[PDB]
Design an enzyme around this catalytic site. Structure first.
Site, PDB file in Angstrom:
ATOM      1  N   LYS A  10     -72.625 -26.532 -53.147  1.00  0.00           N
ATOM      2  CA  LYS A  10     -71.868 -27.713 -53.370  1.00  0.00           C
ATOM      3  C   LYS A  10     -70.691 -27.679 -52.431  1.00  0.00           C
ATOM      4  CE  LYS A  10     -68.143 -28.310 -56.706  1.00  0.00           C
ATOM      5  NZ  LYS A  10     -67.006 -27.380 -56.714  1.00  0.00           N
ATOM      6  N   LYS A  15     -67.827 -23.706 -48.502  1.00  0.00           N
ATOM      7  CA  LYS A  15     -69.118 -23.734 -47.821  1.00  0.00           C
ATOM      8  C   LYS A  15     -69.046 -23.708 -46.302  1.00  0.00           C
ATOM      9  CE  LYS A  15     -71.884 -26.967 -47.868  1.00  0.00           C
ATOM     10  NZ  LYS A  15     -71.710 -26.241 -46.596  1.00  0.00           N
ATOM     11  N   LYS A  41     -69.928 -34.685 -45.518  1.00  0.00           N
ATOM     12  CA  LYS A  41     -68.651 -34.389 -46.134  1.00  0.00           C
ATOM     13  C   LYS A  41     -67.768 -33.532 -45.285  1.00  0.00           C
ATOM     14  CE  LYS A  41     -69.977 -34.568 -51.037  1.00  0.00           C
ATOM     15  NZ  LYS A  41     -69.702 -33.930 -52.328  1.00  0.00           N
ATOM     16  N   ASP A 129     -74.708 -30.482 -53.063  1.00  0.00           N
ATOM     17  CA  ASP A 129     -74.164 -31.425 -54.031  1.00  0.00           C
ATOM     18  C   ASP A 129     -75.189 -32.051 -54.948  1.00  0.00           C
ATOM     19  OD1 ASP A 129     -71.292 -31.221 -53.892  1.00  0.00           O
ATOM     20  OD2 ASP A 129     -71.328 -33.332 -54.628  1.00  0.00           O
TER      21      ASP A 129
HETATM   22  N1  LIG Z   1     -76.282 -32.219 -60.175  1.00  0.00           N
HETATM   23  C1  LIG Z   1     -75.787 -31.325 -59.317  1.00  0.00           C
HETATM   24  N2  LIG Z   1     -76.574 -30.859 -58.319  1.00  0.00           N
HETATM   25  C2  LIG Z   1     -76.088 -29.939 -57.483  1.00  0.00           C
HETATM   26  N3  LIG Z   1     -74.837 -29.479 -57.380  1.00  0.00           N
HETATM   27  C3  LIG Z   1     -74.084 -29.932 -58.402  1.00  0.00           C
HETATM   28  C4  LIG Z   1     -74.469 -30.827 -59.381  1.00  0.00           C
HETATM   29  N4  LIG Z   1     -73.419 -31.085 -60.251  1.00  0.00           N
HETATM   30  C5  LIG Z   1     -72.420 -30.390 -59.749  1.00  0.00           C
HETATM   31  N5  LIG Z   1     -72.763 -29.610 -58.680  1.00  0.00           N
HETATM   32  C6  LIG Z   1     -71.624 -29.672 -57.756  1.00  0.00           C
HETATM   33  O1  LIG Z   1     -70.433 -29.971 -58.476  1.00  0.00           O
HETATM   34  C7  LIG Z   1     -69.689 -31.024 -57.807  1.00  0.00           C
HETATM   35  C8  LIG Z   1     -69.761 -32.295 -58.632  1.00  0.00           C
HETATM   36  O2  LIG Z   1     -69.567 -32.106 -60.026  1.00  0.00           O
HETATM   37  P1  LIG Z   1     -68.175 -32.631 -60.636  1.00  0.00           P
HETATM   38  O3  LIG Z   1     -67.249 -32.692 -59.477  1.00  0.00           O
HETATM   39  O4  LIG Z   1     -67.809 -31.746 -61.790  1.00  0.00           O
HETATM   40  O5  LIG Z   1     -68.719 -33.769 -61.684  1.00  0.00           O
HETATM   41  P2  LIG Z   1     -68.137 -34.879 -62.744  1.00  0.00           P
HETATM   42  O6  LIG Z   1     -67.328 -35.922 -62.058  1.00  0.00           O
HETATM   43  O7  LIG Z   1     -69.295 -35.539 -63.377  1.00  0.00           O
HETATM   44  O8  LIG Z   1     -67.336 -34.134 -63.746  1.00  0.00           O
HETATM   45  C9  LIG Z   1     -70.340 -31.174 -56.434  1.00  0.00           C
HETATM   46  O9  LIG Z   1     -69.688 -30.367 -55.454  1.00  0.00           O
HETATM   47  C10 LIG Z   1     -71.789 -30.758 -56.705  1.00  0.00           C
HETATM   48  O10 LIG Z   1     -72.443 -30.208 -55.588  1.00  0.00           O
HETATM   49 MG   LIG Z   2     -66.034 -26.789 -47.453  1.00  0.00          MG
END
Ligand SMILES: Nc1ncnc2c1ncn2[C@@H]1O[C@H](COP(=O)(O)OP(=O)(O)O)[C@@H](O)[C@H]1O
Ligand SMILES: [Mg+2]
Ligand code: SF4
Ligand SMILES: [Mg+2]
Lengths: 287, 283
Positions: A10, A15, A41, A129
Site C-alpha cells: 500500500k 514503499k 501516487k 492499494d
Molecule cells: N482493500 C485493500 N486492498 C489492499 N490494500 C489495502 C486495502 N485496504 C487498505 N489497504 C491499504 O490501506 C490504505 C487504505 O485504507 P484506509 O486508508 O484505512 O481506509 P478507510 O478510509 O476506509 O478507513 C491504502 O494505502 C491501501 O493500500
Molecule cells: Mg511512498
C-alpha cells in the site's frame, strides 16, 4: 541472470523510498537496474535521477499521440549508478484502467527494447492499494516473477499484503510469479518486529528485512536523492545494502498462502493493536 | 424527488464514518436513506447494522454461481433509522474489477425494485484512493448526481480530491454530475479550517462542513454504532446533524475547476505544511 522484480505494498508506508535506496545499494554493489515506476501516487523514480517529477509514458504518448512517436531516449532517463528510470504513469482520471497503462509501457519497452542491454534487475514499483486487474498485470501478464510485499506494523499494510497474495495465488498455479517475502518498514510500532514475522510465517514467506526509521532518510529525501548517495557511510545505508544483498541472495520464492480475516484479527489483537471487543453495542450512557 | 449522491475520497480519513454519521442524521431527520457500500477498504455499511461485516452481493452471488439467484433480503439489510444497507463486494483479488463490481449491484438493485419504496436519498460509498475507469462508474454511468469529496488537511487527501474532481469534469460535457461541496475531516492540522477552504475556492466549491475530532466518535465506533445512536446529546451528534441540514439543501452544484500541481504545492506551501523546498540537492 536478469532478475525481474516487483514491489507492491500500500502507499503512505514508504514503499517507493525504499525500493529506490534499495536499488541504490544494488548499484553500489555492482549490478544494473531499471525502475519501472508503476505508481500513479508515488514518485517511483525521483530520488535517483534528482528531478522531482519525471515524464510519464502516458503523458508522452499523450502529447505525441501513441507509443509510436515515443523515442526511447526521452522516456528513459539516465540516473545514479547508471540506474534505469521510466515512469509508467497514472491513468487519466475517471477514465481509464491502470492495467492498460502499464502494459503499454512494457510492450513499448520490450518493443523499444530496454530489457535487452546488460541489466541485472527489473524493479516494478507498484500499488498494493487495491489488488485489481489493472495491478495484477505484470503479474498476470507474467512480466514480474519475484514479488516483494512492502509490509508494515499496520492493519492495512497487513491487509494489502494478503490481497496482494491471493493476488499471486490466482496465478502462481499458472506461471512463475512468486513472493520473496515482506519487508516490514519501520513505524515505531511496539512489536512490529515479530508481527511482520507472524505474517510471513502464516503466509508462507519470510520477512527479508526490516527498516528502521532514521531522520537521515527524511534528510536524504528533502534533498531529492538517495540516502546511499547522501552518506553511503551513514548507518542506514548499510541498513539498505543488507536488504540489497539479502534479495540478490533470496532463494525463497514461494506460492503464498492467504489467511482468513479472523486470523488476521487475532494477530493484531494478540500483538495488541486491534483492541479486544465486548458485546456492549448500545445505549450510550443511557445503558 | 429521490436524490442520488455519493461520497468519495481517499481511504483512511473516516469517510466511511463521517459518511455514516451523516446518513443517520438524515434519519433522526425523518429522511429515508439507503447506502451502497462500494468501498473495498472500509466499513461502508456497518454502523447502521451493528454488524461485524455485511455480506456483499458479489460475495453472495458467488455462492449460487449467479446473482439471478441472490435474494434481495440476503442483500438488503435494514439498519437503524431503516437505512437500507447494501454492500457491493470487493474486486476479487488479483482478478477482476470494481466498476464491473459496483454495476452488478446497481442493476440488481433496480432490477429487484430497490430504487422504489419512496426514497429520499442514496449514498454511494466510493473510494477515490485511485479514481480510475471503475471508481468513476457511478459517475460515468450517471447513477450518482450529487458529489461530495471528503477531504482533510493532507498531501494526498487533497491531491486526490483534485483528481476525483477531474473525474466530474470529463462528465461535464456528459452532464448531470456535479460536485456538492467538500467536507474536511479534521486531522488536528493548524490551518486546516483555512486550507480546505482554500482548495474549495481555487476549486470553486464550498467546504460544507468541518468535522472535528471528538473522541466521542470512536467511542461509538468501538461500539459498532453512529454517534447519534450513541450519545445523541453530543457535540458531535449535532455536528453530523448540522451536515445533513446543509446537505438536504445545498443547491450549489458546481462544475469543478481543477488546479495545477504547484498551485497545489503552494497551498501546502502557504500553510507551512509542505513548507519551503530546498534548491540545493547534494550531500
Ligand atoms: N482493500 C485493500 N486492498 C489492499 N490494500 C489495502 C486495502 N485496504 C487498505 N489497504 C491499504 O490501506 C490504505 C487504505 O485504507 P484506509 O486508508 O484505512 O481506509 P478507510 O478510509 O476506509 O478507513 C491504502 O494505502 C491501501 O493500500
Ligand atoms: Mg511512498
Ligand atoms: S482494472 Fe482496476 S484500476 Fe483499472 S479501471 Fe478497473 S478497477 Fe480501476
Ligand atoms: Mg474510514
Amino acid at each position: 541472470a536478469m532478475r525481474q522484480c516487483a514491489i507492491y505494498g500500500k502507499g503512505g508506508i514508504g514503499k517507493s523510498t525504499t525500493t529506490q535506496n534499495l536499488v541504490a545499494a544494488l548499484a553500489e554493489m555492482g549490478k544494473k537496474v531499471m525502475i519501472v515506476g508503476c505508481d500513479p501516487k508515488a514518485d517511483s523514480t525521483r530520488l535517483i535521477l534528482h528531478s522531482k517529477a519525471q515524464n510519464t509514458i502516458m503523458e508522452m504518448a499523450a502529447e505525441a499521440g501513441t507509443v509510436e512517436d515515443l523515442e526511447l531516449e526521452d522516456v528513459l532517463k539516465a540516473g545514479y549508478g547508471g540506474v534505469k528510470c521510466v515512469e509508467s504513469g497514472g491513468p487519466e482520471p475517471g477514465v481509464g484502467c491502470a492495467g492498460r497503462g502499464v502494459i503499454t509501457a512494457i510492450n513499448f519497452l520490450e518493443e523499444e527494447g530496454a530489457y535487452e542491454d546488460d541489466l541485472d534487475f527489473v524493479f516494478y514499483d507498484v500499488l498494493g492499494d487495491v489488488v485489481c486487474g489493472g495491478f495484477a498485470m505484470p503479474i498476470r501478464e507474467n512480466k514480474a516473477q519475484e514479488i516483494y510485499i512492502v509490509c508494515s506494523g499496520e492493519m492495512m499494510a497487513m491487509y494489502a499484503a494478503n490481497n496482494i497474495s491471493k493476488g499471486i495465488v490466482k496465478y502462481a498455479n499458472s506461471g512463475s510469479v512468486r513472493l520473496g517475502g515482506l519487508i516490514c518498514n519501520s513505524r515505531n510500532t511496539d512489536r512490529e518486529d515479530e508481527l511482520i514475522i507472524a505474517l510471513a510465517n502464516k503466509l508462507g514467506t519470510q520477512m527479508i528485512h526490516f527498516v528502521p526509521r532514521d531522520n537521515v532518510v527524511q534528510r536524504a529525501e528533502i534533498r531529492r536523492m538517495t540516502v546511499i548517495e547522501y552518506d553511503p557511510k551513514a548507518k542506514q545505508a548499510d541498513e539498505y545494502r543488507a536488504l540489497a544483498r539479502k534479495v540478490v541472495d533470496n532463494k525463497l520464492l514461494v506460492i503464498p498462502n492467504p489467511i482468513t480475516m479472523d486470523e488476521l484479527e487475532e494477530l493484531l489483537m494478540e500483538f495488541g493493536i486491534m483492541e479486544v471487543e465486548d458485546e456492549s453495542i448500545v445505549g450510550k450512557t443511557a445503558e
